[PDB]
């Protein structure tokens, strides 16, 4: 699905992609949800992940109107949710999953610089 970004970017400020984020992202929630999965185990694959399809395109529009980096989060809408692995390299099963609304705060093929941190995350549809 199509995601959104959030950041704690300050509305008034000129560092190039603080500028982008203020006009691209919502303010960040200081209390996200991270719920322990009981009992169950889920299959991950960093290499088949359509979160590294959308991030990569926002870095395009970042530069497009560009002319200190801050943390950006990526998050899901209703009907969907992010499962995160608490175990793991990038592929195969994972017993300790928890569900999250957003990713961690990310300092910025740079797709795969993102996969260096993405690997733990995956989307599912309710």
């Amino acid at each position: 699905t199509t995601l959104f970004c959030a950041s704690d970017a300050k509305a008034h400020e000129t560092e190039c992609h603080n500028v982008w984020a203020t006009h691209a992202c919502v303010p960040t929630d200081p209390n996200p949800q991270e719920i322990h999965l009981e009992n169950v185990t889920e299959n991950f694959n960093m290499w088949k992940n359509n979160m590294v399809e959308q991030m990569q395109e926002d870095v395009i529009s970042l530069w497009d109107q560009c002319l200190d980096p801050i943390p950006i989060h990526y998050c899901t809408p209703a009907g969907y949710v992010i499962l995160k692995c608490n175990d793991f390299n990038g592929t195969g099963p994972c017993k300790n999953v928890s569900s999250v609304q957003c990713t961690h705060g990310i300092k910025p093929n740079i797709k795969d610089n993102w996969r260096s941190e993405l690997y733990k995350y995956k989307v599912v549809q309710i």
């Epitope: 006009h23 303010p27 926002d58």
Partner: antibody, heavy 120, light 109 residues
Amino acid sequence: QVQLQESGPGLVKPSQTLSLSCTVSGGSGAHYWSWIRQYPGKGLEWIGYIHYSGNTYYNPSLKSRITISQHTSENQFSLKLNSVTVADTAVYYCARGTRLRTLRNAFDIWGQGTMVTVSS
Amino acid sequence: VLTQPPSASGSPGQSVTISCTGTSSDVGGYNYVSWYQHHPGKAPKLIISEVNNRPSGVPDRFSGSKSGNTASLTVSGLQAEDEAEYYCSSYTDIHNFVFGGGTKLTVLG
């Protein structure tokens, strides 16, 4: 399913203080909850919005005449416009603004509009 | 604040285009131009987002664009049901928005 219904009092006296409620109905993210008015023709003016987080963002041309608020209770939200004149006669729409990529800074869902009239 | 033409006509089948002239801080300062279809007494449909993006369930025949500070919207292959009024909006400044006066797209019968 996500619809919006506006509700409100249709007449107000000048110098009084208009206030409208919009009732969401689908339906629950990171959207924005907005008030936009139509001066028929003219004519389309963004009033302001408030974020799910509670951040308000108003149109600078309303020098303090204006607040927007939430009732997570009854899945609704509302606007207060002050010191109205006949000028403020218009159709008032409520709407959902998104900051999803591919829809950033746009208004995906709208309200059916409702008329409001200022007169002594 | 944005400038549109008042009217725009075409027969069934024809193709039509609608200008929306802004300034460098409105259009041509951002790729956040949007377009709304509005039938009377009925709730506006967003049809183009972020300069040229059709949302789901919006037919391939509507299309967006912008050259300089003049964004523009096209309907290729008219049908009777496309007759409505069309507005454009653009993001501008730290959290603010502007619109056009609107354009009546008449499908000739």
